[PDB]
Amino acid sequence: LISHSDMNQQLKSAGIGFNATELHGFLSGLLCGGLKDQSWLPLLYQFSNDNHAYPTGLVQPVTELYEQISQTLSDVEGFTFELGLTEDENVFTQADSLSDWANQFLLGIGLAQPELAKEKGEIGEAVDDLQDICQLGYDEDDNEEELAEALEEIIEYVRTIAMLFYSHFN
Amino acid sequence: LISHSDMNQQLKSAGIGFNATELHGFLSGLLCGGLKDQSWLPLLYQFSNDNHAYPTGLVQPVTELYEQISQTLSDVEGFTFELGLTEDENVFTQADSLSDWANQFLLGIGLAQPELAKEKGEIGEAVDDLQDICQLGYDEDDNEEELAEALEEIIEYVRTIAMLFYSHFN
Numbered sequence: 576l577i578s579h580s581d582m583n584q585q586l587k588s589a590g591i592g593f594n595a596t597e598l599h600g601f602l603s604g605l606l607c608g609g610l611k612d613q614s615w616l617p618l619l620y621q622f623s624n625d626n627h628a629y630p631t632g633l634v635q636p637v638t639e640l641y642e643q644i645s646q647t648l649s650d651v652e653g654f655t656f657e658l659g660l661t662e663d664e665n666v667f668t669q670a671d672s673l674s675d676w677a678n679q680f681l682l683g684i685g686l687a688q689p690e691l692a693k694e695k696g697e698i699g700e701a702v703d704d705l706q707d708i709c710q711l712g713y714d715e716d717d718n719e720e721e722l723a724e725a726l727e728e729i730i731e732y733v734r735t736i737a738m739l740f741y742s743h744f745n
Numbered sequence: 746l747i748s749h750s751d752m753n754q755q756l757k758s759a760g761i762g763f764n765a766t767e768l769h770g771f772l773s774g775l776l777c778g779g780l781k782d783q784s785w786l787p788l789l790y791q792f793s794n795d796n797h798a799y800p801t802g803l804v805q806p807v808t809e810l811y812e813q814i815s816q817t818l819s820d821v822e823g824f825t826f827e828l829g830l831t832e833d834e835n836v837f838t839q840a841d842s843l844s845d846w847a848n849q850f851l852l853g854i855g856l857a858q859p860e861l862a863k864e865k866g867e868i869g870e871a872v873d874d875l876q877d878i879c880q881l882g883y884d885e886d887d888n889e890e891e892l893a894e895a896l897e898e899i900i901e902y903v904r905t906i907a908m909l910f911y912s913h914f915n
Contacts, residue, residue: 652865653868654867697824701905704901707897711894711898713891721882721884724881725892725895726895728877728898728902729895731870731871731874731902732898735871735902735905736905738867
């Protein structure tokens with residue numbers, strides 16, 4: 576699998592509407608909502624490229640990423656799924672990235688589960704929590720672990736939500 | 746059920762080693778680790794009162810709390826379990842309280858599951874995350890939602906962990 580920076584650059588040079596973090600969230604969202612056929616391709620094209628298919632050479636690593644996401648979620652022995660956020664050290668930039676990831680995960684899972692709004696219990700609470708997370712606002716020049724420590728826990732929670740969803744919907 | 750402030754005061758006047766938040770965590774920890782008999786009483790007495798039983802009048806509300814915790818975790822329709830933290834508005838004080846809660850939850854669940862250290866996958870990750878949460882350090886005079894927003898998500902994650910544990914161990 577190509578690196579995050581590598582994917583970011585191939586997507587940008589092809590003029591795709593998603594950066595690598597957004598691609599990771601959208602595809603994880605479709606898989607956690609239980610999508611199992613090849614309809615992820617036309618959905619990806621509709622929502623990230625104005626209905627145009629990706630060029631050859633980009634299609635392959637993107638598809639390898641899809642499969643890697645799918646396999647880790649089918650549980651390569653409990654909890655191997657990773658979010659695929661920015662590698663930027665600025666904690667405020669990691670915050671932004673998690674939010675960025677969350678918007679596309681919510682879009683994907685909602686396309687896969689058109690009646691998600693009806694879910695209650697823990698599934699409904701997680702849906703509400705991800706929606707709050709994509710607008711999680713911070714600031715100041717902190718650059719500290721204060722926000723870092725907190726963020727890492729929120730990240731573990733989002734990984735857990737991704738596992739709970741995949742199980743409920745697969 | 747008596748209020749949090751009420752329980753805090755009855756525990757303090759009886760010289761008990763736990764405040765109300767700590768009591769809530771310890772009992773939730775024993776129940777999430779699957780304890781099902783009346784051994785929670787001598788364990789509570791050993792770890793919160795130097796092996797002395799609680800006085801009459803305190804024993805009753807404490808036992809009502811135990812039952813309330815047990816019933817909400819058996820899932821009074823998905824996700825009704827609450828942590829029972831401090832009602833103090835200072836976000837830094839809520840942070841401290843969550844940590845306070847987490848130490849006793851970890852003590853309880855570990856007494857109920859003496860081999861918890863061997864768990865891997867998501868259960869092992871949650872155990873590691875709660876252990877990081879009880880030492881979650883913050884500071885400054887922020888008093889903001891910055892930390893508030895983040896804390897609420899961490900709180901939802903701990904509620905979720907409590908549900909995942911109860912299910913794995915009940």
